[PDB]
A paper describes a structure:
A plant called [name] has a light-sensitive protein called [name] (or [name] for short) that helps it keep its circadian clock in sync with the cycle of night and day. In [name], three [name] domain containing proteins [name], FLAVIN-BINDING, KELCH REPEAT, F-BOX 1 (FKF1), and [name] KELCH PROTEIN 2 (LKP2) act in circadian timing and seasonal flowering. Recent research indicates that their divergent roles in the circadian clock and photoperiodic flowering may enable interrogation of how chemistry regulates PAS/[name] protein function to select for signaling pathways. These proteins retain analogous elements, where an N-terminal [name] domain regulates activity of a C-terminal E3 ubiquitin ligase to target clock proteins for degradation in a time dependent manner. [name] domains are typified by blue-light induced formation of a C4a adduct between a conserved Cys residue and a bound flavin (FAD, FMN or riboflavin) cofactor.
Towards these aims we solved 2.5 Å, 2.6 Å, and 2.1 Å crystal structures of dark-state WT [name], G80R and V48I:G80R (residues 29–165) respectively. Consistent with solution studies, the crystallographic lattice is defined by two sets of anti-parallel dimers formed by extensive contacts along the β-scaffold. We term these interfaces the ‘compact’ and ‘elongated’ dimers based on a 2 Å translation that is coupled to the degree of order present within the Ncap. In contrast to other [name] proteins, where a conserved Gln (Q154) acts as a molecular bridge linking the FMN to a residue in Aβ, the dark-state structure of [name] contains a heterogeneous orientation of the active site Q154. The altered orientation is coupled to contacts in the Ncap, Ccap and helical interface. In [name], Q154 does not adopt a specific orientation as observed in all other [name] structures, rather it varies in all four molecules in the asymmetric unit of both WT-[name] and G80R. The lack of a side chain at G46 permits favorable interactions for Q154 at the flavin O4 position and allows insertion of F156 into the flavin active site. In this manner an unusual orientation of Q154 links the Iβ-Ccap hinge and helical interface through a QFF motif (Q154-F155-F156). In our [name] structures this is not the case, rather dark-state structures have a heterogeneous orientation of Q154 that samples orientation near both the buried conformation and an exposed conformation. Rather, we propose that steric interactions involving the flavin O4 position and G46 shift a dynamic equilibrium in the Q154 position to stabilize the [name] protein in a light-state configuration.
Residue numbers in the entry:
A (entry chain A): 13 to 135
B (entry chain B): 4 to 137
């Protein structure tokens, strides 16, 4: 009895969607513990390991920019992009985002659902 | 020597539900611990079935309670059927029969074939003035 996907919840009211919650599948597949990711953005998953300072070149710029647009416009998203576990191994992430609307027609949260998929790998 | 996974579960802010969009009538293949804790129903009891049982007042009412709004329920059927998102607020009930106010979001997952393979349901059980009590 275990989830088929990663779940992530961000606070859409604070700036830049800080993570307030990740599920155990997120933790187990990416190798990052909740306690090291809370209060920050998920884009760290696009840098190869905890110490790369730049978005890795094999993650699709075009897809990343679609995420920005969708978040900006308060609409849902789905796409595939390269991520990396804490140990730097690559990881393919079939990601879906959906916003949660509060009373005032303002967004309180975004939900992230990650369907992880692995690869042939290099490096 | 590892750090355990799942230390902050107690802080999960919402229920999560996953259904199989391919089998008939959206059978549940996963629910999270919040769902379990808030609704009072354990996974073993709900897996394999449709989520609609929550509109019945407790486990012994066979049908949806007269007070849940059929228009919202209709909007849900529509969104599931058309393959699109849904958000709305829906009267539900715990296993003990107390009212829950469910701020439900549904979002479909498209697989390889550009085919919906799952639906995700997210439940923010929210503060409500609704009370049916003694
Ligand atoms: C709820 C939520 C979950 C997200 N989950 C992931 C994820 O699992 N992997 C990933 O690479 N990006 C994820 N993102 C995307 C990044 O947070 C970010 O929004 C994206 O990289 C675009 O912003 P940027 O160009 O400023 O980096 C998620 C975003 C949100 C709001
Ligand atoms: C992923 C998913 C999650 C759902 N979660 C709930 C829920 O938490 N509470 C609820 O009353 N209905 C939920 N539903 C809705 C019912 O399963 C059903 O689709 C709805 O009652 C409309 O169909 P019906 O009129 O045949 O019962 C969910 C549906 C899906 C697909």
């Amino acid at each position: 009895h275990t989830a088929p996907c990663g779940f992530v919840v961000t606070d859409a009211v604070e700036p830049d969607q800080p993570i307030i919650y990740v599920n155990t599948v997120f933790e187990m597949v990416t190798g990052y513990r909740a306690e090291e990711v809370l209060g920050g953005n998920c884009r760290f998953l696009q840098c190869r390991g905890p110490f790369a300072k730049r978005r890795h070149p094999l993650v699709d710029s075009m897809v990343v920019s679609e995420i920005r647009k969708c978040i900006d416009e308060g609409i849902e998203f789905q796409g595939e992009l390269l991520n990396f576990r804490k140990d730097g191994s690559p990881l393919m992430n079939r990601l879906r985002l959906t916003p949660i609307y509060g009373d005032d027609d303002t967004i309180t949260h975004i939900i992230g659902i990650q369907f992880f998929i692995e690869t042939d790998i290099d490096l």
